[PDB]
Amino acid sequence: AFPSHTESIQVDSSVSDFPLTITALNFPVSTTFKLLGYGQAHVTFLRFKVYALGLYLAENDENLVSDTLNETYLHKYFLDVDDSKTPKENLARLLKRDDSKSVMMIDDLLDSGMRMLAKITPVRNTDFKHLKEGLVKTISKHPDVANNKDTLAKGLSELNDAFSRKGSVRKNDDLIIELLANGALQFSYHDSKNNEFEVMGVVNNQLVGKFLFSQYLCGEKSPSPQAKKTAIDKLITLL
């Protein structure tokens, strides 16, 4: 009769709240996802706001953080461990350093089979071309692009075909990007005016989803600094 618990948060007041939990009954996704980080995304020096971003982690994959980033990882890949601090304190410190070693850590997490969602909600009317191009720009900032140029190019072509729908996207619509355990991407669209979902294409090339979500979580110039900041803090609590 009297619901008393908050299940969503207002990432940006111009669009609808982001749910803390996304299940296969709410969206066309494969498992239960929990909000990890969130924030607004801006572009260019004019700080032009383009969308609100929600990053989600599969509930059943929360164990993968500590299974991957542990005291073994720490001494295997770092040679500057402060022995006065615990392993989790050192791992947290190194993740917050926000340097090339932080990227390595996030990339290793992504290789562990960690399943994720990105919910992208435009704050103005746009179109699928611009959403797609924004993902390409993000992917292209990953530090390892130059060492995987040809394979990545094949993946970016898959990304074009994955955007099966063409045309307008309304403010407050949702693009849903799901990262599968194997690294593939599944795309989906939510028409919020008519409350209709359209499943779109897939990208099976692993580099695409790996580079995209790595840049969301730890990019030097990430699309949403606040989503990066909140997601990293939340990942640290799972150590």
Author numbering: 83 to 321
Question: Any passages from the paper?
Answer:
Here, we demonstrate using proteinase K protection assays, sodium carbonate extractions, and crystallography that Aim18p and Aim46p reside on the mitochondrial inner membrane and adopt CHI folds, but they lack select active site residues and possess an extra fungal-specific loop. Consistent with these differences, Aim18p and Aim46p lack CHI activity and also the fatty acid–binding capabilities of other CHI-like proteins, but instead bind heme.
Full-length constructs of Aim18p and Aim46p possessing N-terminal 8X-His tags were insoluble, but truncating the N-terminal mitochondrial targeting sequence and transmembrane domain for Aim18p and Aim46p (Aim18p-Nd70 and Aim46p-Nd62, respectively) dramatically increased solubility. We also generated point mutations of the CHI catalytic arginine—Aim18p-Nd70-R123A and Aim46p-Nd62-R107A—to serve as experimental controls. Each protein exhibited robust thermal melt temperatures ranging from ∼48 to 67 °C, indicating stably folded protein. Interestingly, catalytic arginine mutants lacked this golden color. We used a fluorescent heme detection assay that uses heated oxalic acid to liberate the heme molecule of its central iron metal, generating a fluorescent protoporphyrin molecule. This experiment revealed that Aim18p and Aim46p coimmunoprecipitated with bound heme and that mutating the catalytic arginine significantly reduced heme binding. Of note is a region of the Aim18p-Nd70 and Aim46-Nd62 structures that lies in between plant CHI α1 and α2. This region contains an extra loop that is absent in plant CHI domain–containing proteins but is conserved across multiple ascomycete Aim18p and Aim46p homologs. Nearly all of the CHI catalytic residues are substituted nonconservatively in Aim18p and Aim46p except for the catalytic arginine, which is invariably conserved in fungal homologs of Aim18p and Aim46p.
